[PDB]
Amino acid sequence: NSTATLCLGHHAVPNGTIVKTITNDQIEVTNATELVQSSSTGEICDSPHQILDGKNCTLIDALLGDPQCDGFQNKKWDLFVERSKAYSNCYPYDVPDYASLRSLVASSGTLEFNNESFNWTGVTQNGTSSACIRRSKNSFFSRLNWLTHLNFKYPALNVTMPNNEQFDKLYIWGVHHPGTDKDQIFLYAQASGRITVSTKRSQQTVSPNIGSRPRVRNIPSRISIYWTIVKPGDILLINSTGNLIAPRGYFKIRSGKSSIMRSDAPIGKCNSECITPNGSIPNDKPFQNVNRITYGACPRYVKQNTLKLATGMRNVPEIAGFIENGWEGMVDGWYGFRHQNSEGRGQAADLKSTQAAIDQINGKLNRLIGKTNEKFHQIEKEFSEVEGRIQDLEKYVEDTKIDLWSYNAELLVALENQHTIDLTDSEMNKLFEKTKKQLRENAEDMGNGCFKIYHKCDNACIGSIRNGTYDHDVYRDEALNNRFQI
Amino acid sequence: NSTATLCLGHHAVPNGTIVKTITNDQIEVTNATELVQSSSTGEICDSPHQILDGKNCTLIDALLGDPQCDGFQNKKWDLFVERSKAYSNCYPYDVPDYASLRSLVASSGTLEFNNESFNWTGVTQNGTSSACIRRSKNSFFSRLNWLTHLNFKYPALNVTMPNNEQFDKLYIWGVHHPGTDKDQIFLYAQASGRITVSTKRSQQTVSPNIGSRPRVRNIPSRISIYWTIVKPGDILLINSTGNLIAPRGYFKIRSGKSSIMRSDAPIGKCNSECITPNGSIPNDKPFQNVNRITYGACPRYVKQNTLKLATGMRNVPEIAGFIENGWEGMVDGWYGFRHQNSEGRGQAADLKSTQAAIDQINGKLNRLIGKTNEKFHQIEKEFSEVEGRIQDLEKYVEDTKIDLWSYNAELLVALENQHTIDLTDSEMNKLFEKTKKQLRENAEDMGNGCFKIYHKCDNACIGSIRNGTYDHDVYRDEALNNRFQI
Amino acid sequence: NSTATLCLGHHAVPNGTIVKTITNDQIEVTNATELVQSSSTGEICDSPHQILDGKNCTLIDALLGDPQCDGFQNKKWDLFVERSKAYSNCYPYDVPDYASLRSLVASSGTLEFNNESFNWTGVTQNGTSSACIRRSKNSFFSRLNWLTHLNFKYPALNVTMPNNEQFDKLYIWGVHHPGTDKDQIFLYAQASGRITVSTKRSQQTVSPNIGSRPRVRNIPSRISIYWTIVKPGDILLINSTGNLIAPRGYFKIRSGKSSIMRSDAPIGKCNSECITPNGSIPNDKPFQNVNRITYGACPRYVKQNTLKLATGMRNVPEIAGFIENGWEGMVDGWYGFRHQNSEGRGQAADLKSTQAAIDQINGKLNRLIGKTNEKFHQIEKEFSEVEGRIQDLEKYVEDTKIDLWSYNAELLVALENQHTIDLTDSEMNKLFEKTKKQLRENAEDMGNGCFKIYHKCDNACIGSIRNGTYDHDVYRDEALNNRFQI
Amino acid sequence: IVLTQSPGTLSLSPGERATLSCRASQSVSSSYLAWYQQKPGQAPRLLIYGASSRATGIPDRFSGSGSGTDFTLTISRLEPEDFAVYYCQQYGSSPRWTFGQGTKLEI
Amino acid sequence: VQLVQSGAEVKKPGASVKVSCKASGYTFTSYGISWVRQAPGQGLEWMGWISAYNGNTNYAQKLQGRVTMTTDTSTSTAYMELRSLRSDDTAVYYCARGLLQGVVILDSYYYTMDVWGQGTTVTVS
Ligand SMILES: *[C@@H]1O[C@H](CO)[C@@H](O[C@@H]2O[C@H](CO)[C@@H](O)[C@H](O)[C@H]2NC(C)=O)[C@H](O)[C@H]1NC(C)=O
Ligand SMILES: *[C@@H]1O[C@H](CO)[C@@H](O[C@@H]2O[C@H](CO)[C@@H](O)[C@H](O)[C@H]2NC(C)=O)[C@H](O)[C@H]1NC(C)=O
Ligand SMILES: *[C@@H]1O[C@H](CO)[C@@H](O[C@@H]2O[C@H](CO)[C@@H](O)[C@H](O)[C@H]2NC(C)=O)[C@H](O)[C@H]1NC(C)=O
Ligand SMILES: *[C@@H]1O[C@H](CO)[C@@H](O)[C@H](O)[C@H]1NC(C)=O
Ligand SMILES: *[C@@H]1O[C@H](CO)[C@@H](O)[C@H](O)[C@H]1NC(C)=O
Ligand SMILES: *[C@@H]1O[C@H](CO)[C@@H](O)[C@H](O)[C@H]1NC(C)=O
Ligand SMILES: *[C@@H]1O[C@H](CO)[C@@H](O)[C@H](O)[C@H]1NC(C)=O
Ligand SMILES: *[C@@H]1O[C@H](CO)[C@@H](O)[C@H](O)[C@H]1NC(C)=O
Ligand SMILES: *[C@@H]1O[C@H](CO)[C@@H](O)[C@H](O)[C@H]1NC(C)=O
Ligand SMILES: *[C@@H]1O[C@H](CO)[C@@H](O)[C@H](O)[C@H]1NC(C)=O
Ligand SMILES: *[C@@H]1O[C@H](CO)[C@@H](O)[C@H](O)[C@H]1NC(C)=O
Ligand SMILES: *[C@@H]1O[C@H](CO)[C@@H](O)[C@H](O)[C@H]1NC(C)=O
Ligand SMILES: *[C@@H]1O[C@H](CO)[C@@H](O)[C@H](O)[C@H]1NC(C)=O
Ligand SMILES: *[C@@H]1O[C@H](CO)[C@@H](O)[C@H](O)[C@H]1NC(C)=O
Ligand SMILES: *[C@@H]1O[C@H](CO)[C@@H](O)[C@H](O)[C@H]1NC(C)=O
Ligand SMILES: *[C@@H]1O[C@H](CO)[C@@H](O)[C@H](O)[C@H]1NC(C)=O
Ligand SMILES: *[C@@H]1O[C@H](CO)[C@@H](O)[C@H](O)[C@H]1NC(C)=O
Ligand SMILES: *[C@@H]1O[C@H](CO)[C@@H](O)[C@H](O)[C@H]1NC(C)=O
Ligand SMILES: *[C@@H]1O[C@H](CO)[C@@H](O)[C@H](O)[C@H]1NC(C)=O
Ligand SMILES: *[C@@H]1O[C@H](CO)[C@@H](O)[C@H](O)[C@H]1NC(C)=O
Ligand SMILES: *[C@@H]1O[C@H](CO)[C@@H](O)[C@H](O)[C@H]1NC(C)=O
Ligand SMILES: *[C@@H]1O[C@H](CO)[C@@H](O)[C@H](O)[C@H]1NC(C)=O
């Protein structure tokens, strides 16, 4: 014929996906990726982090030396896993400010213990109880020394332990609370008195309180656990007349990345930087919806189950071009041309604009994938007891953090999707304008993303147009005679 | 004439609204809506939440059984409203960690109390005081039993109360601190001793402290209030030699949405999902500036007094089109056509592009209005007493949350206003390009948003152009004759 | 010749700056500014804030009256600077909940102290110790009164101090803990008993604990420091049988902007609204990377070492226009024209599009620069002791705040840079479309940002085009004869 | 999308509280969901617009609620005149509406 | 506000039916008109919507290519022509007020169909 049609357009797919934008809650796009990791593997992997599986022990039971926790002596960890099945199997005890000691040790990350020789004269050492059975024999906590009277005398103790090291020493000690006064006389041969443990920077005075308590493992008495930190150059002085559960030495306090987590997940074998109570998770996606409790290089926790990031163009499902619809028959790229001339129909993708759009999308993806924030010790996020004001503040802080990160994730995804669509529409417009400018006065814009080229134009001139080599001067006289009827 | 001028343009109003954008701090728009709720109704609604008006009674006074609070026995609430006029009118008392007990009960949401029969043998029961007058008779707290000596003997109590139910039991008990030694002997016939209340998991030991205190309601003595939570399967054991203010039973602990608020606002007949200390507010707008203390489905608190979200076009108030100014005479739509031809002048709106712009604005509005997040029990945000580091942390957390949400509100409004403006400019440009492509070579762009059509074009012709039915070829020869003189 | 070329373009620079946008991590721009303040001056400014340099004193030692702190009596401050060299040189003491009392005084902002006449009969006043040497004499804390027996008797004290003022009174008092029982008898002639300090709303009972502690300044004894706040209309009652370190009066509690900071920076003679532990910093930039501990109108603390905000155009290093590259030889403005005609080759700048771009950039800078967050008293952000759960929560809150503000800073900068680039590309396109519309049918778009004008167009012609006065009807016949060959 | 009616109130009587609900295959904005009452022989009438707002004159008992993917009509106390087929409506981004299968609430 | 539909129709398979809906009490061009099919038994199948304001339409995928909707502003009427009727199309056809047009919607009311016609009861075969 005397006139050719050259149409420009973009690909489409039979069934696209729905993403959210600033302007439209439901825009159909050719492709999208999930940015929220909604599921775990079900196992906590033993690497890269060092994980100490508490099995039947809690961290405090391992700290004190519960007979069932002998396998935890002098251990180190990056993450301590506390099981819901853990239980105490030793003399009943309580820890004032339990959460602080548990956090303190979990943060330290070690049960390394150095024995020290305390004078403890005039008293009987290594008291035992039927509650703590170690080797089918009555025992006591392996890191505590239950002192009792010697020959019906318990002289006042004034025992000095200087700290001549360069590190903080953690001393764990306690106070015996007998069930009855008869037990107080039997064990200490005197009135309760009081126990004072002090350092140059501190003092703690605890009185025994004799009285019956509900029996736990047939024991009506309790031991209260206290701890003290001795700085380098300081001195630990224990002044006690009875009811003292003495230290046997000290634990080291070190800084580090250690923490404690509560989880019943089995320990697996893999390399995964992010550990949650539900198991290790991939840390490639910027967000997760698995848990609130995390350790390592984890995605940020959000409340959305799914957030879809567009990675392609608007689908616009179905010669004519971009303005009317997309082209479902194009599989070699995202942008292209269709032709109708004296030879027949044709089609070829434009790969440079496809690659430009892909490069911009890949840029956004690189900015959003594998960019997690590594966190270690954090506040407790789940509670089993009603504690009051402190627990309420911890819950409020976490709820605020989660709501703010969920907002940021929703806004960020809507922002990235709107920019992806605007950029690929701009690229479509750039290709159309480039073709129009190349054609100069040899073609007219028909209004549907197509040019009417007013001259005979075989496949060679069409190819020249596609690759940017169309010389409008050679066809100017023919095009003007057909277009304006000179 | 032999030509016609077809101008495209958009509406304008005599007085627009000034909104903020990312690029322009003060851009005039044809319309805008307020996204910050800056006023309340002044009343708390009875619906949908159950509101318990504390009147003269604080939550703790209701918990203990202050005679003026007899009307609060076994009540339930979703929100407890504490009035600033409330005062105690019973035996003077204090509560160590008062805030924790108040929060604990407020979040429990019920004062349901179940009486239990404690052995209390060898002592007298139902002690009274002239400070607590119930029905013109000396009385005491309705949920406490003030025990005294019997026949000048107060034998040691060792009273067991097992927890055989499936729920946590909250026991409220206290310790009497007499004014002088004569009161201690008169009431207990012996030295203060100590009170130990324990469970299998924990113990609390409190010693009475005899001494004079400033008289409150002519009472020189005090009662300290302690509480314990007994888990299912546990046992409450009370070991006491005197000075015990015994429990009469237990309170239930539930999980739920209950909380406590301090407010002097009246309670009225209305329905609102958001309760503030200033009364209920609408929860349609995404943000509020009424208060930081909220309950229910409340907007997020921001510092901004106003945030205006554009819901329209740039105003640009005042033939010529959109390039020079807007058209103040349009009432039918937002975008349209104006023409001068051989018959006279005229104007008609383009309603499809108007609706497209409106639908996009409706989309933006849908994501903000009616998407309010629901919160219930939170930290305290206002304090009457100076306390220490915990109060400082609570204030810091709330100020951090407010600063971050105010930032998010400011950025969100600026981004959405910038996109609304860019969209309406895009719709104007799409209509202009549609008209230009439809006219093709029969008209020239004069640079003011208007086309000069180089042929006779009657009102049917202009209407054909406006509705997309213009036939390009019919007028081509005439237009070319006029445009180029052949 | 018979035609002329008019090229439109924009300036370029030999070496630009790399900035981040939403689309591209490293885009070179002609200019950028730093938004993160990464260094301090090294000195704290003493204006506009009142700064009290603690020198060798801590706030608590200034409060109690350590002799070396005599120069701090009755002082006020906006910021109290605690030095790392500070040490006590007086009787050894401890303060339960030290952090809270330090926060109380720091928030109050004053050491103003009023003396009160307490009855203190039957006892010897003004006890002294060799630990506290004031003016080469044994002394004691200047705000405390160490009471001892009189004539080997220490009658029970019941001393009333009503609060008849209109403000809260802060009373500081303590409890003596003798090293031995010989000291308890020597100083008090009787057993320790207990000390009760109470008001209508609260009571504190502390028992002395006799025992040896590690010697500090050769003293084996300690004083425990307690405080009470007496509201207007209330009464302070001190009930004591011995071991009382009595108050000498009260400190005022005020509300205000005062706070405490730990810093070894010198205090200079300068003016800065933002004080950090590293010294004062400029507060012009919206963000800082100097410290998390701030006082005053400070920028937000972020983790990023640098954030660069584009303040210029995309840099495209090198007739042809803006489609292929920028023009490095332009010095007059940002946007401009070049031409080649029968007279020669020339160049001129378009200063109205340039100024429009400058105005929009200035708008962004005015919204970002000079807007800071004024905050005064905050939580402690650095710790020297392992405290447990409370310290962990304070650290968690600060880490969350820092991560959220760093995210906000990163997203804000990427958005501002993306909008700046899009706006200046839009301004280039607006100038190109304006020129094209002005030329009408007398020129063709060459595809490289240049127009071929099909008539003789001298420098007066080009100037007419540049300033918007070109009349296309003057040259229309020549232009059509040249464009279409008749 | 597609809505699943999952009828849970097929047989009730006067004075009982209805728990009639609707589940969307995808989460939706609460502003785009509505409840309708269709009596035998009559055109459907709108009861609730949004998740919880009453439209025209209606008894106070017709107070519903919901969010996310799960919405409930929650008729406080039924009366004989309230037995009808109840439809769950969802508005999409495009000017399109979808209805559920309908829960028949009868004596 | 009232919507009045045409009366009952009986058609043979292969015929088309055009159902009218006249509006009264509100500006016709301020809202769209939605058409909904209530089959015997079964639930409510939405068929389509047309904007009286600007003439835009939206159709259910099952009926694309079969239903043509039109409005007449002067009469304030809407029409729906259903082509190639089959016996499966016997149903009561309702018209209802649809979306608000020409005004920005802030309230959730205007996303619902609050005014319904009577139902024409069209029988096919
Ligand atoms: C106080 O009461 C408790 C329980 O009422 C007593 O504890 C019980 O002691 C018997 C043996 O005497 C055991 O068989 C029970 O199992 C114990 N029960 C509990 C819950 O501990 C306790 O002995 C009493 N004390 C005194 C001094 O009477
Ligand atoms: C300790 O002092 C207080 C006050 O100085 C005494 O309390 C006063 O007792 C009288 C007794 O008639 C009352 O009228 C006053 O109203 C009380 N005032 C206050 C503030 O309590 C208290 O009795 C004294 N205690 C002893 C043991 O002497
Ligand atoms: C308890 O032991 C400490 C240290 O073992 C004793 O304190 C020492 O006392 C001597 C003089 O008596 C001083 O020279 C030392 O410097 C002190 N050392 C420390 C660490 O304080 C303390 O006196 C003993 N207590 C009793 C009652 O004997
Ligand atoms: C979407 O992109 C991924 C690569 O990220 C590709 O593997 C997948 O086939 C794409 N899907 C479609 C429908 O284009
Ligand atoms: C934990 O205790 C249970 C008690 O029955 C025992 O069966 C199990 O083997 C214990 N686990 C370990 C690791 O000791
Ligand atoms: C242990 O203490 C006693 C009494 O203080 C002392 O006599 C004895 O020497 C001490 N033991 C040593 C130093 O080994
Ligand atoms: C106490 O037990 C430890 C081992 O736990 C032992 O080394 C020490 O000699 C024992 N001392 C006495 C007095 O039995
Ligand atoms: C993660 O663990 C919590 C607590 O066990 C659980 O509620 C949540 O559903 C888990 N998440 C996943 C994805 O399984
Ligand atoms: C463009 O295509 C034409 C037609 O095949 C060919 O002759 C010409 O060499 C091509 N140019 C380039 C740069 O590929
Ligand atoms: C609260 O106390 C005041 C004291 O005068 C009394 O007048 C008022 O009636 C009381 N209110 C209630 C609800 O008991
Ligand atoms: C104490 O008061 C309660 C209140 O009901 C009563 O049931 C109980 O019998 C009284 N006991 C004595 C000993 O007065
Ligand atoms: C606990 O009760 C027993 C009962 O005999 C008594 O001997 C003991 O002193 C009591 N202890 C306290 C602290 O009340
Ligand atoms: C609400 O109450 C608080 C505290 O009384 C007040 O600061 C605030 O301005 C009040 N707001 C309104 C809108 O009344
Ligand atoms: C467009 O307007 C012209 C002039 O009024 C009219 O003749 C023509 O029928 C219209 N077409 C449509 C589809 O509205
Ligand atoms: C960048 O802008 C600053 C002013 O903010 C100016 O002083 C500087 O010279 C500019 N640099 C360039 C290369 O234009
Ligand atoms: C601070 O203490 C050091 C060491 O005792 C002393 O040299 C210095 O002069 C003191 N400075 C002041 C201001 O007290
Ligand atoms: C105690 O010291 C103060 C110091 O000003 C003095 O006024 C007071 O008289 C002294 N009292 C005795 C008993 O020394
Ligand atoms: C402290 O040790 C001395 C040693 O003689 C003793 O007399 C005194 O009672 C002890 N104090 C306490 C509280 O144990
Ligand atoms: C309080 O003072 C009175 C005055 O006689 C005295 O009897 C009582 O023992 C004192 N109490 C204390 C705890 O000091
Ligand atoms: C400020 O001081 C802190 C603590 O000494 C240090 O970590 C930080 O790097 C310092 N910053 C600058 C800019 O000096
Ligand atoms: C525009 O430039 C031409 C060049 O000769 C000059 O004559 C004319 O006056 C200028 N107009 C304006 C408004 O600057
Ligand atoms: C702004 O929009 C609202 C809601 O669409 C409308 O009620 C109001 O009249 C509008 N105002 C203007 C000036 O268009």
Residue numbers in the entry:
A (entry chain B), B (entry chain C), C (entry chain A): 8 to 325, 335 to 502
D (entry chain I): 2 to 108
E (entry chain F): 2 to 126
Quote what the paper states about this structure.
A core issue is that hemagglutinin (HA), the major viral spike protein and seasonal vaccine immunogen, preferentially elicits antibodies against its hypervariable regions, limiting coverage and compromising pandemic preparedness. Broadly neutralizing antibodies (bnAbs) targeting the hemagglutinin (HA) stem of influenza A viruses (IAV) tend to be effective against either group 1 or group 2 viral diversity. Differences between the glycosylation positions on the group 1 vs group 2 stem also impose steric constraints that hinder intergroup-reactivity to bnAb supersites.
Notably the CDRH3 loop (QxxV) is at the fulcrum of this rotation. This flexibility around the QxxV fulcrum is underscored by our finding that N55 forms more hydrogen bonds with the other residues within CDRH2/3 loops (S52, N57, and Q102), while T55 showed fewer interactions with those residues. Collectively, this indicates that the CDRH2 loop with T55 is more flexible to accommodate the changes in Fab binding angles. Our data indicates that this public amino acid substitution provides a ‘fulcrum release’ action that pivots the antibody to accommodate a conserved group 1 N-glycan and extend ‘hardcoded’ germline recognition of group 2-only to group 1 + 2 stems.
